[PDB]
Design a protein around this ligand. Sequence first.
Ligand SMILES: CC[C@@](O)(C(=O)Nc1cnccc1C)c1cccc(Cl)c1
Ligand SMILES: CC[C@@](O)(C(=O)Nc1cnccc1C)c1cccc(Cl)c1
Lengths: 304, 304
Amino acid sequence: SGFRKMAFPSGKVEGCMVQVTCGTTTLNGLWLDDVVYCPRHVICTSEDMLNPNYEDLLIRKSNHNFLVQAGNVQLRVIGHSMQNCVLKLKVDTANPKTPKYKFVRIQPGQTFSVLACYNGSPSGVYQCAMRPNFTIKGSFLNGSCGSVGFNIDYDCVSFCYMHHMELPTGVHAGTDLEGNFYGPFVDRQTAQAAGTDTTITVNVLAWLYAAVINGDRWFLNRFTTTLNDFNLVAMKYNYEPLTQDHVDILGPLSAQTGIAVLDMCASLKELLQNGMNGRTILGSALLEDEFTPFDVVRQCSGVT
Amino acid sequence: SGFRKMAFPSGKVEGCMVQVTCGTTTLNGLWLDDVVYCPRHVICTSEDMLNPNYEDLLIRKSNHNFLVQAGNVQLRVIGHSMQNCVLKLKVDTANPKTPKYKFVRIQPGQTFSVLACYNGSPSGVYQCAMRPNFTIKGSFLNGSCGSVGFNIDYDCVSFCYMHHMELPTGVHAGTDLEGNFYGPFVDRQTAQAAGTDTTITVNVLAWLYAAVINGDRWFLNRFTTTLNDFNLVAMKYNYEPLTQDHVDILGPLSAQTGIAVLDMCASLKELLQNGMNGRTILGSALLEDEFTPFDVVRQCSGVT
Ligand SMILES: CC[C@@](O)(C(=O)Nc1cnccc1C)c1cccc(Cl)c1
Ligand SMILES: CC[C@@](O)(C(=O)Nc1cnccc1C)c1cccc(Cl)c1
């Protein structure tokens, strides 16, 4: 029993972190096989960041300008290329600690673990959700760029995020491992709007099921609702509209607890309309949306 | 910017986890050098747990009865001994992945990362605080016994906790790595009282400083208080009394923010007396107490 915001064990990712330096800029890189992946803004000075022409900037760089260090050993750079907003530095040595891996582009509302790094060294690990507006609410300081997000399925690491920037609002933006930004963001020091964020409804329902499984049941009521009635309330409270696809993914939790998804929606409706009245759910005084239905099943069943 | 409940990178600990089986009971063990540490209740059947005589139970066991498996390779057991509530199984091979380590007994209110494991395999990592009543609010299911808590200082892992049991209340109890329980708990399936828990006042103040550093300032007020006036409020709200030792540890955060510790105490006093009025602090609708002043400095400065 108990329910925590749990991150994946970070060992397989720690073995891939390297430090990348170009000129006077240092950030993190990800060494998988004989390639090091890092944000392309490693080639910029602070002055370049205001309006960088990455193609022109990269042309003044040669393989020997990219200094890649793994722990205390230097990697020899034999190739360099830009793919979208990431640089791929071909090295002469395959990372001996390369885990089985995939590059995946996650959907908004999905969760992942972040291994925050500075100078190629891991500082901590935490669990994040990609917001519906494609930002992440992380914990990152200058130098954390190149830190990655990932999920693990048995022995396979699916890398889904690489950190690139902090918006003036204090929220974070980054790319998939092909260098494609999540959201409308560009890798330039200019004010950029993150659209309206919404609460991930399917995750809140999943977390309500986790609460029932662990004994926190005070919010269960004698009511039910319909998908259309519930979505009228979701719209009013800036919650994502719930679809039959979301109900279908909640199926296993509905089966295990015997609480129909629409009955849980009616509990969520009353919580939105009346608040928590000074009470808590799983040690939280607000509705938590950074646990997917998959996360709830995994944590509640001890998947390793 | 941003502030997250961050755990230490778990790689160094993942390399130490093993599976220990004795009879029909399987749990986790910690392999450091040529010794495997695990909860002594690995020698019990469910029937023994009601009132075990560990000395008598261990006498019916020989080295060959303890099956220790690291990944897929079997370790040869050449010695066994009981120290308090842990078993130490001497093996013929030193763990090649043994990190630099220490065994430490933490104080209540201190924090640590837990690597939850099942069958010797890591499932997740999360950050915990040892409650003032010496319980932890973890996420553990049957089979998680032997999972450990730890802190890391550069390359040194200080192991501080080994999981042993879940109390009937759903909270968790365990030992230091010498097998000494934190709190009054015994390793027996009998109802056991965890005393009154209190909120870790110095940690809440540290988290309030983290909030100010990250821009959440609405709770700062025009008031101040004294240690004695503040402690009258702390007693009324089941908060730990604040001492000059606690004020001294908050010194660096007071210096960085320019907010005197007693002025932050007056902000905390008003929050306790008036609540949050439907507002949040660092994405929380309650006062968070599982970040120490050390954690706040480390996270806010990017220590790796
Ligand atoms: C220092 C600026 C920047 O490197 C950044 O946001 N870094 C940064 C990242 N995370 C947290 C804090 C900081 C400071 C920057 C700014 C705009 C665009 C891009 Cl691609 C990069
Ligand atoms: C199954 C009982 C027990 O192994 C336990 O609490 N395990 C357990 C641990 N964490 C979470 C869930 C479970 C179930 C037990 C009970 C009393 C005393 C002791 Cl030393 C051990």
